A paper describes a structure:
Methylenetetrahydrofolate dehydrogenase/cyclohydrolase 2 (MTHFD2) is a bifunctional metabolic enzyme found in mitochondria, exhibiting both dehydrogenase and cyclohydrolase catalytic activities. In one-carbon metabolism, MTHFD2 converts 5, 10-methylene tetrahydrofolate (5,10-CH2-THF) to 10-formyl tetrahydrofolate (10-CHO-THF) in mitochondria, thereby regulating the production of NADH, purines, and pyrimidines. An isozyme, methylenetetrahydrofolate dehydrogenase, cyclohydrolase and formyltetrahydrofolate synthetase 1 ([name]), performs similar catalytic reactions to MTHFD2, albeit localized in the cytoplasm rather than the mitochondrion. The key distinction between these two proteins lie in their expression profiles: [name] is typically expressed in normal cells while MTHFD2 is abundantly expressed in immortal, embryonic, and cancer cells, but absent in adult normal cells.
[name] was a competitive inhibitor of human [name] (IC50 = 630 nM) and MTHFD2 (IC50 = 80 nM). To investigate the molecular basis of the selectivity toward MTHFD2 over [name], cocrystal structures of human [name] were determined in complex with 16a, 16d, 16e, 16g, and [name] in the presence of NADP+, with resolutions ranging from 1.99 to 2.50 Å. Superimposition of the [name]/16e complex structure with [name]/[name] complex structure uncovered several differences between them. First, in the structure of [name]/[name], the nicotinamide group of NADP+ was hydrogen bonded with the NH2 moiety of the triaminopyrimidine headgroup of [name]. However, the addition of a chloride substituent on the phenyl ring in 16e induced a clash with the nicotinamide group of NADP+, leading to the shift of the nicotinamide group of NADP+ away from the triaminopyrimidine headgroup of 16e and the consequent loss of the hydrogen bond between 16e and NADP+ Instead, NADP+ in [name]/16e structure was found to be hydrogen bonded with the side chain of Thr279. Second, in comparison with the [name]/[name] structure, it was observed that the addition of the chloride atom in 16e led to the rotation of the phenyl ring by approximately 26°, accompanied by the movement of the γ-carboxylic acid away from β strand h1. The shift of γ-carboxylic acid in 16e resulted in the loss of the van der Waals interactions with Leu51, Tyr52 and Tyr240. These effects collectively contributed to the weaker inhibitory activity of 16e toward [name] and consequently improved its selectivity to MTHFD2, as shown by the increase in the selectivity index from 7.9 to 27.1 compared with [name].
Author numbering:
A (entry chain B): 3 to 242, 251 to 296
B (entry chain A): 3 to 240, 251 to 296
The structure:
């Protein structure tokens, strides 16, 4: 049976490490702290929870994190005033807009996200940072936090990535598409599947590394898993309890390593955001 | 055997349509002409050839194309000055830097490319345009010209892309990587291969659509091809041969691009199309 990749434990070690860096950066440049801002439009329940988890992580580490919550009646123009203000405020080192925006008005999300200064785009959602990642220019770009966290989970298996066949199910802007790029430039051979893929079960069965980011509860069946695969489940689904996008019971009988839900990718997403925030704080000093 | 995808004939149809568009444009707004600039660093023979092919196509269409060639010893700072000048010249609608740079001094290609204004980046090489393409924002970006030409050749088959398994061999900034994205947002299931891919023959055999962009002459064997595959060969290797072993591949493919006269003419035609598109937007 598969060994469990314990994201809860792994993230803790990352956060302890970040806390020491933050404490150490204070006794290098005094009064200086990493500063994060999180902008929210509307009042989605899941966004409220995820933002709150991120605030807790930043607090424990020493990052000063501000949460701005705009109402559902907010217009695209009002959101842009905040993005411009956060770009200009040299005390803010990174910020992000929690997605999706929950507005009754029509707001161009792509236009909002792409007003974020790329040097503060710790969520890696601007076209500029996406374009660097998608073309293999990894040294000078923020990488989206869920793919970052999935790569770290993969590395914890000690199984090298180069030459393996990776399958990514899902191509969303925040997870699946950057996940493909990250695996590719770590020299996996990568297949991307989506809602138009035919014979999904056959495609999934080719993955030595499998990352599932569909938002469909337990859709990926254990039978589909290649024996010995490294299975990374990004799904967080509320069903009649929380389950992921992989049928966990069947899959753990065939994988060599598997992420549980909860306690797998989710805590790693948050840890990687704090790491990117510290990185933009350190970069700002230079 | 395969039907041949005649890139010579298809590109001539595209260039004639563009010529008539430009003619009509000039009738509607007298004195206006689409303008392209090509910047080159060094004096590579292949670059000289491909640039010359581009200038001739622009001339046939009625696009005014200027070519600026800098010596092998130019500095990054001097290359940047020209890019700034091109960005600021409001009579220039698109421009590109022919790659690779041939310099004696270390010049940061990524910094040079990324100083191009995205609205004039007709080669689609800026990070801004790459990121738009890579995340499916296909209406607000220039797509690189060779992937655009490959997509048009695949569409000439009349077979829908959606649901097919496509294999891209190569991940370069100009061809392989944007090709993956174009096929992905046409709803293919896409596998990307590279020089660390193990069992390349088995990955190629999965491809209903196969695009080979490696620069390794005839390395992709015909026996690896899935029977009935659509086979797109971007290679130009020096006779001139492609990246696919053509004779064996043609036996098994449903459609296949010859080399030469396949992808090559389509690449140039797609550059002209993007140029005319930038000029049209600039009137608007
Ligand atoms: N977004 C969040 O705030 C958040 C928070 C926690 C967890 N998650 C988890 O993170 C992952 C990504 O979520 P997201 O919101 O970024 O995704 P999303 O925008 O909802 O996109 C889902 C992706 O899965 C694909 N897909 C859907 N049904 C499929 C099927 N039956 N077969 C194959 N592919 C299918 C879609 O294909 P198409 O592109 O063709 O539509 C799309 O690429 C999910 O597992 C989700 O549960 C999300
Ligand atoms: N560049 C031009 O001006 C030009 C003009 C005419 C024609 N072309 C054609 O355009 C295509 C791309 O050219 P490019 O300049 O963009 O090439 P490039 O930058 O050299 O990229 C070559 C790609 O092929 C991959 N590759 C090399 N050997 C391989 C192997 N044995 N198995 C699998 N993948 C392998 C490389 O993998 P890695 O990423 O691991 O290195 C890389 O992604 C080629 O077909 C070329 O003939 C180019
Ligand atoms: N801009 C932006 N928008 C977004 N919608 C996201 N996604 C985005 O926050 N996801 C997310 C998922 C899981 C958790 C998480 O902490 N999950 C824990 C459970 C947390 C708890 O309840 O304590 C787990 O799965 O184990 C946090 C964030 C993002 O990263 N950036
Ligand atoms: N910036 C930039 N750099 C680059 N290096 C390229 N590639 C870039 O120009 N390729 C290219 C390929 C083929 C031809 C072409 O016309 N090929 C003909 C043969 C050429 C001839 O023999 O005259 C054919 O295959 O049929 C022209 C350009 C590019 O498109 N943009």
């Amino acid at each position: 049976p598969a060994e469990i990749l314990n994201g809860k434990e792994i993230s803790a070690q990352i956060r302890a490490r970040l806390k020491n860096q933050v404490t150490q950066l204070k006794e290098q440049v005094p009064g200086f702290t990493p500063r994060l801002a999180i902008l929210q439009v509307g009042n989605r329940d899941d966004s409220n929870l995820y933002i709150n988890v991120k605030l807790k992580a930043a607090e424990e580490i020493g990052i000063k994190a501000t949460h701005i919550k705009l109402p559902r009646t907010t217009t695209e123009s009002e959101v842009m005033k905040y993005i411009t203000s956060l770009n200009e405020d040299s005390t803010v080192h990174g910020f992000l807009v929690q997605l999706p925006l929950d507005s009754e008005n029509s707001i161009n999300t792509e236009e909002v996200i792409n007003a974020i200064a790329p040097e503060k785009d710790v969520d890696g959602l601007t076209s500029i940072n996406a374009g660097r990642l998608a073309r293999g220019d990894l040294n000078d770009c923020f990488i989206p936090c869920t793919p970052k966290g999935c790569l770290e989970l993969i590395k914890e298996t000690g199984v090298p990535i180069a030459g393996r066949h990776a399958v990514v199910v899902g191509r969303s802007k925040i997870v699946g598409a950057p996940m493909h790029d990250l695996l590719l430039w770590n020299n996996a051979t990568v297949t991307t599947c989506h809602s138009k893929t035919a014979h999904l079960d056959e495609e999934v069965n080719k993955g030595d590394i499998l990352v599932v980011a569909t938002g469909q509860p337990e859709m990926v069946k254990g039978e589909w898993i290649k024996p010995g695969a490294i299975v990374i489940d990004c799904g967080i689904n509320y069903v009649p309890k929380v389950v992921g996008d992989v049928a966990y019971d069947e899959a753990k009988e065939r994988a060599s390593f598997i992420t549980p839900v909860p306690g797998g990718v989710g805590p790693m997403t948050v840890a990687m955001l704090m790491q990117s925030t510290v990185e933009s704080a350190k970069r700002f000093l230079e």
